[PDB]
């Protein structure tokens, strides 16, 4: 069965932030408008028996000082008076400012994503669901003691921790426009959680990592890829702007297949940030949600074909209607692949709460008309072999080679 995280309180909290506003409501309501909810298993967000238990859970990754500061940020933003100079300095020291501002619900909002992704992980662990979706989660940039890119708590890292602690190996796949730095860092030293991010990278583009390592020497630059026992276990594919569905699919396809073959993961966690869409305000990549093929749908279908318990998460995407259009198709596709039953989504957006937001055409398709990679493939193939050799993994080097 395919599970999805939702709930009345969950929805309210996920819609309480200034940056993402009511995005989660549009997503879930569009899924509902397409009559998909009865096909899905409702997974309630996790709750804790006490403040201490909650704190224990979140500090499994985050520092106590950082969690304390994030809690204080909420309290301060629920008061009339301005922050003191000392409190400003404190918040700045955790990057709780700039693109990670405070707001009255900042702690509750951030924690909600954690509640949802932990619950999703548990439903996979006890085998209640074969796949679980959490469109309220996917906050890949949050660090141990730093907020980053409107990510305050890293629900992904905490969920993966739960999965690995349930030998267990986890494959993390980050499809967002931006490098999955927080998750990559969290597992930099662990061979058990392999991370793979495909993203745009270019000078001055956030967050700046996931590409060639810039250092003071004249040698050709190279990629960092993990450390200690985690050497070779962090994979990255930076792509130039403008890439379309087909080229993006061909770029990541062989990599995904080779990773599954070599790693043989017990769980897959996929971050499906929707900011690669051609209609995203970034205007960097040109992916679509087309399903006659959308790069996103191509990747998800491939991952699902592995029949490995899978967690599907959200992430970036500041065009709310088109993010909803994409995730609705991802959800329908997941039902179809898992349950082996056909879904017939009307090409026309059905009347519902937010119908008006889908102008002007009101169709399910987004309103859009559509050497380096070979070098990356060779590099990645070499890294995969290196990872396998270091971890004494069994597999056919030629079969994997033939994938590319
Ligand atoms: K990414
Ligand atoms: K790793
Ligand atoms: Zn992003």
Author numbering: 2 to 167, 177 to 302, 316 to 393, 402 to 435
From the paper:
In our study, we show that Schistosoma mansoni histone deacetylase 8 (smHDAC8) is a functional acetyl-L-lysine deacetylase that plays an important role in parasite infectivity and is therefore a relevant target for drug discovery. The smHDAC8 adopts a fold similar to hHDAC8 (r.m.s.d. on Cα's of 1.2 Å between the human and schistosome enzymes), forming a single α/β domain composed of a central, eight-stranded parallel β-sheet sandwiched by 15 α-helices (α1–α15). In smHDAC8 these three ions and their coordinating residues are conserved, thus reinforcing the similarity between the human and schistosome HDAC8 enzymes. Therefore, the flipped-out conformation of smHDAC8 F151 appears to be highly specific to the schistosome enzyme in contrast to human HDACs, suggesting that this feature, together with the specific replacement of human M274 by schistosome H292, could provide the basis for the design of specific inhibitors targeting smHDAC8.
Crystals were obtained that belonged to space group P1 and which diffracted to 1.8 Å resolution. The final model contains four independent non-crystallographic monomers (r.m.s.d. on Cα's from 0.1 to 0.6 Å), and has good deviations from ideal geometry, with R-factor and R-free values of 0.15 and 0.19. We were able to crystallize smHDAC8 in a non-inhibited form. However, we observed in our electronic density the unambiguous presence of an L-tartrate molecule provided by the crystallization buffer which was bound in the smHDAC8 active site where it coordinated the catalytic zinc ion. Our structural data suggest that HDAC8 enzymes display some flexibility at their active sites, which could explain that small molecules (e.g. L-tartrate in our native form and inhibitors in the other cases) coordinating the catalytic zinc are required to stabilize the protein and support crystallization. First, as expected, we observe the replacement of M274 by H292 in smHDAC8 that diminishes the hydrophobic character of the pocket that normally accommodates the aliphatic part of the incoming acetylated lysine. Further, while the position of smHDAC8 D100 is similar to that of its human counterpart, D101, we observe a change in conformation of the smHDAC8 Y341 side chain compared to hHDAC8 Y306. In contrast, the smHDAC8 Y341 side chain points towards the rim of the catalytic pocket. The most striking and certainly least expected difference concerns the smHDAC8 F151 side chain that is turned away from the catalytic pocket and is inserted into a smaller hydrophobic pocket formed by loops that surround the active site. In the schistosome HDAC8 enzymes, this leucine is replaced by a serine (S18). This smaller residue enlarges the pocket accommodating the F151 side chain, enabling it to adopt its observed flipped-out conformation.
